[PDB]
Structure 1
Amino acid sequence: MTYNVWNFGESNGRYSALTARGISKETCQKAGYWIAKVDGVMYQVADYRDQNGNIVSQKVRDKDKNFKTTGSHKSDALFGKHLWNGGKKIVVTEGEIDMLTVMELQDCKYPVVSLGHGASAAKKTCAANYEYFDQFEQIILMFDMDEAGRKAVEEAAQVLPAGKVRVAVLPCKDANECHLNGHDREIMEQVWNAGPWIPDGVVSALSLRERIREHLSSEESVGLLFSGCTGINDKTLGARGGEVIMVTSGSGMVMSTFVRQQALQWGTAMGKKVGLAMLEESVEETAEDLIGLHNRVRLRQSDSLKREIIENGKFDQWFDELFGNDTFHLYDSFETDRLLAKLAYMRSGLGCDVIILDHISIVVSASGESDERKMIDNLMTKLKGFAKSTGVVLVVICHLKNPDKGKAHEEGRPVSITDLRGSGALRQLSDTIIALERNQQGDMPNLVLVRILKCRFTGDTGIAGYMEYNKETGWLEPSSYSG
């Protein structure tokens, strides 16, 4: 069975004043803070009773800073709880000693209880007690003034009733550190009429004027026009900042070109600084692919031409030409959290306005975890957050699972959002979905279709135009085509 509740007298109990803490003898007596001594050593016993009066559990201390917990310390334990059933205001402190403190300063006339497992179990202990606490008009959380102590407050109020919670703010670690010669009157100024705060994300409209004005000028209706197929633009009205554009398709390298192409035109035609995380390939590789693409020549794909422009100065020339406006910047590799962070500093530090993330399918590093199904989603959100939270345009490439149904991807087979990878997060969190289809064994093996699979901002979706691969220049050229 469980540790017996410690009998007063059985263990040599006295209600003595805690001289070390400025808690009077009369105080310890009311809350049930007694001083026993069993088998030789002298222990400090805190008596936890339920609202009914019966002692349900004990928290016992010895000098050196140890414990021993008697009875059954249920997940809803509040030290002092049995003293108050109702009231206009109840202070709730982190530990027993701090409860004893407020209980002083007030001549034990008002209510104070302390958290049963305090520290970390702020959330559980609290929500376990919704009803009990709602018995009072306002709940004053007087927790520790540190890292985990402010956190405790936060998790606490979350589960605590309505517009009643108010945060205590003391000059020192806890309400007792104050008492222990310092500022009793500081504790007082909080018990009465202290801070009431909890909206860390609620935001009245009035208080957005400025943020709105500056938005309206900054971010553009026609934010960034997709290039190589008016259509993509006609339907989606562009890549507005804070959005998350998602490019997808079959085997599509067509896809990795299309994205590349866009990177190109936004980083040169338009003023915009592009940031690239091309996770598949090296940073040098992607740079070449850019240069080549910008020069309408298949650069890496040609021994001869490489040599040629290294020697004839054209390389250093082309390179300056394309790059020398500090406008392209690349994440270069060899975790999820770790990547997200790098991409953030591209946004925040070098301040690019597009970040293109080639190929979500690659999660990578933190291995002990199941379905890419689930995780793909988890990343998905951090990303959408990143996006909206910072207004960067985040294009995100993503590759297609493979049918099981008759016609494959190179057989053109169109794609739907069902057709979608993930398990819902992209299918949701993404603002525009552009898909590109290509039936590489057919009539126009170089002809590629573009479906808009979705577009929050307009919701005008569907077939949106065609392009044609120029095997020769490397580009997705725009094409004449319809019924």
Structure 2
Amino acid sequence: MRERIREHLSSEESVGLLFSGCTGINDKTLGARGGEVIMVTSGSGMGKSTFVRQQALQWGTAMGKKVGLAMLEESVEETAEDLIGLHNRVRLRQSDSLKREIIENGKFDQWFDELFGNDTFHLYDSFAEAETDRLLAKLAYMRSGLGCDVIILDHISIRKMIDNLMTKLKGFAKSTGVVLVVICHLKDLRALRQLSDTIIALERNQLVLVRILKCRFTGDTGIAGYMEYNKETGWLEPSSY
């Protein structure tokens, strides 16, 4: 047992992929570990996507990880547009001028390569269909075929569709070891709660309050901290609340 415990101790990964922008989030969760399902939830338009996107950006950009992004609601272009802006600390969607300026400027192309030039980000859309298996098959491919370290499922609202899916999702994450972040629309009580390993909730006015509704691994619950949305850069920043 001794030797058995020892190696077990020295082989265990407690700290996963560290989150960004919120001082305290890592304290109460110790980051995202492989095989776990992270659930990021809150009210519509409360900043879920932004937050996740930011995590994705840092993970694949600074952590040198491969990030797959599966969009159920919006298109790839939309997603790409969002990441590009984010990476360049500008809101493309809000500036008809910038979009126009950047294309003839040649900055679009320079931006596109400096972000997707590499084999780091994998964006997939057109899952508009309500079939789970069709979805799991793509996810599995993103894992195996594209070697994605993190998979972000955007999004789900919240029957068996969700119940069974959550159970399929959790099974996929646990057996492969990928990090599966799922974005869910809330319109704790608010499978969703059960299978999810860590549940993060953002709150606003009723500056965004980051609440850790659940963390199996750590058990440490409560509010991790606050973030301040930069309307000019579109980045959620750490706060001094």
Say whether the fold is shared (TM-score over 0.5).
yes
Distance 1:359 1:420, change over 3 A: farther
**Structure 1 segments of 4+ aligned residues over 6 angstroms from their partners:** 208-219
CA distance in 2, matches of 1:331, 1:214: 39
Distance 1:315 1:426, change over 3 A: same
Does the Cα contact within 8 Å between 1:360 and 1:396 map onto a contact in 2?
A: yes
Q: CA deviation at 1:313?
A: 1.0
Does the Cα contact within 8 Å between 1:219 and 1:241 map onto a contact in 2?
A: no
* Residues 147-179 of structure 1, C-alpha deviations (whole Å, 9 max, x = no match): xxxxxxxxxxxxxxxxxxxxxxxxxxxxxxxxx
CA distance in 2, matches of 1:315, 1:291: 9
Q: What secondary structure does 2:3 align onto?
A: helix
Q: What secondary structure does 1:248 align onto?
A: strand
Q: What secondary structure does 1:379 align onto?
A: helix
Does the Cα contact within 8 Å between 1:219 and 1:240 map onto a contact in 2?
A: no
CA distance in 1, matches of 2:89, 2:21: 14
Answering whether residue 189 of structure 2 is matched by residue 420 of structure 1, we say yes
Sequence identity, in percent? 98
Answering whether residue 172 of structure 2 is matched by residue 386 of structure 1, we say yes
1:266 aligns with 59
Kindly report which structure 2 residues correspond to 1:20-419, keeping only aligned pairs within 5 A, or say none: 220-333=13-126, 335-361=131-157, 373-400=159-186, 419=188
CA distance in 2, matches of 1:210, 1:386: 31
Q: What secondary structure does 2:136 align onto?
A: helix
Q: What secondary structure does 1:468 align onto?
A: strand
Q: CA deviation at 1:274?
A: 0.4
Q: CA deviation at 1:332?
A: 2.0
CA distance in 1, matches of 2:11, 2:141: 20
Q: What secondary structure does 1:321 align onto?
A: helix
Distance 1:390 1:310, change over 3 A: same
CA distance in 1, matches of 2:154, 2:43: 14
Q: CA deviation at 1:209?
A: 14
Q: CA deviation at 1:375?
A: 2.5
Gaps of 5+ in 2: none
Does the Cα contact within 8 Å between 2:156 and 2:182 map onto a contact in 1?
A: yes
TM-score (norm 2): 0.91
* Residues 43-95 of structure 1, C-alpha deviations (whole Å, 9 max, x = no match): xxxxxxxxxxxxxxxxxxxxxxxxxxxxxxxxxxxxxxxxxxxxxxxxxxxxx
Does the Cα contact within 8 Å between 1:252 and 1:438 map onto a contact in 2?
A: no
Q: What secondary structure does 2:61 align onto?
A: coil
Moved more, 456-465 or 331-340: 331-340
Q: CA deviation at 1:252?
A: 3.4
Distance 1:259 1:210, change over 3 A: farther
Gaps of 5+ in 1: 1-207, 363-372, 401-418, 440-445
CA distance in 2, matches of 1:310, 1:473: 19
CA distance in 2, matches of 1:309, 1:218: 48
Structure with the higher fraction of residues in helix conformation: 2
* Residues 437-460 of structure 1, C-alpha deviations (whole Å, 9 max, x = no match): 012xxxxxx910011001011001
Q: CA deviation at 1:426?
A: 1.3
CA distance in 2, matches of 1:327, 1:214: 33
Larger radius of gyration: 1
CA distance in 1, matches of 2:5, 2:136: 27
CA RMSD of superposed structures (Å):
2.7
CA distance in 1, matches of 2:143, 2:3: 22
Q: CA deviation at 1:374?
A: 3.2
Q: CA deviation at 1:376?
A: 1.0
1:429 aligns with 195
Does the Cα contact within 8 Å between 1:357 and 1:396 map onto a contact in 2?
A: yes
Does the Cα contact within 8 Å between 1:380 and 1:426 map onto a contact in 2?
A: yes
- Tell which has more relative contact order, 1 or 2 (C-alpha 8 A, sep 6+): 2
* Residues 19-58 of structure 1, C-alpha deviations (whole Å, 9 max, x = no match): xxxxxxxxxxxxxxxxxxxxxxxxxxxxxxxxxxxxxxxx
Q: CA deviation at 1:301?
A: 2.1
Distance 1:318 1:218, change over 3 A: farther
Does the Cα contact within 8 Å between 1:331 and 1:343 map onto a contact in 2?
A: no
Q: What secondary structure does 1:474 align onto?
A: coil
Q: CA deviation at 1:259?
A: 0.7
CA distance in 2, matches of 1:209, 1:350: 39
CA distance in 1, matches of 2:238, 2:172: 32
Distance 1:374 1:212, change over 3 A: farther
Distance 1:219 1:226, change over 3 A: farther
In the alignment of these two chains, the number of paired residues is: 237
Does the Cα contact within 8 Å between 1:276 and 1:331 map onto a contact in 2?
A: yes
Q: CA deviation at 1:321?
A: 1.2
CA distance in 2, matches of 1:276, 1:450: 22
Does the Cα contact within 8 Å between 1:252 and 1:436 map onto a contact in 2?
A: no
Distance 1:252 1:211, change over 3 A: farther
Q: CA deviation at 1:420?
A: 3.3
Distance 1:214 1:267, change over 3 A: farther
